[PDB]
Swiss-Prot record:
Disulfide cross-links: none
Protein known as: E3 ubiquitin-protein ligase Mdm2
Gene: mdm2
Organism of derivation: Xenopus laevis (African clawed frog)
Protein family per UniProt: Belongs to the MDM2/MDM4 family.
Function: E3 ubiquitin-protein ligase that mediates ubiquitination of p53/TP53, leading to its degradation by the proteasome.
Compartments, record wording: Nucleus, Nucleoplasm; Cytoplasm; Nucleus, Nucleolus; Nucleus
Annotated ranges, domain SWIB/MDM2: 10-93
Domain of life of the native organism: Eukaryota
């Protein structure tokens, strides 16, 4: 937690839908880096309990904010390629590491 000042990776902004999932998954801010995004999202499933007893790597929940987001009522977590894609397209605004000065009306 104590590094210096600039040591944060570029974080993206999840869609208002995915956002809430993070919001309830322990996320607070509106933007999050893929790691954090993929982190709260994974917890969002276990918490809501979208996984099947049979297969633990299976997530099929017809009534779920996540399902309505990805646009499917069933998906396996074995093919990260598929998920990694849909989750990436669920980002409204993308933030990058650049010089962004704040305006506090103080001069």
């Amino acid at each position: 937690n104590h590094i210096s000042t600039s040591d944060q990776e570029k974080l993206v902004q999840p869609t208002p839908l995915l956002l809430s999932l993070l919001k309830s998954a322990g996320a607070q801010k509106e933007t999050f880096t893929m790691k954090e995004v993929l982190y709260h999202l994974g917890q969002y499933i276990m918490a809501k309990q979208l996984y099947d007893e049979k297969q633990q790597h299976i997530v099929h929940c017809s009534n779920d904010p996540l399902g309505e987001l990805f646009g499917v009522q069933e998906f396996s977590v074995k093919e990260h390629r598929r998920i990694y894609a849909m989750i990436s397209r669920n980002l409204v605004s993308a933030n990058v590491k650049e010089s962004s000065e704040d305006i506090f009306g103080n001069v």
